[PDB]
């Protein structure tokens, strides 16, 4: 699977966004854009996440 680690907290701006906290491990599901990817959190919730806020895991 493709996983990333949150480098900073992200509160989410649009309703499609996936809010997260620094340290969270997220799984990448799709990359419809270069800097915005769809990911899933440890609870199974899905949403868009900003690439600059994460590092590869």
């Amino acid at each position: 699977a493709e996983y990333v680690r949150a480098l900073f907290d992200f509160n989410g701006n649009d309703e499609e966004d996936l809010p997260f906290k620094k340290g969270d491990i997220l799984r990448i599901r799709d990359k419809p854009e270069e800097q915005w990817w769809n990911a899933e959190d440890s609870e199974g919730k899905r949403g868009m996440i900003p690439v600059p806020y994460v590092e590869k895991y």
Partner: peptide, 8 residues
């Protein structure tokens, strides 16, 4: 935190 990138 870093700048949140624009959407397209």
């Amino acid at each position: 935190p870093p700048p949140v990138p624009p959407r397209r």
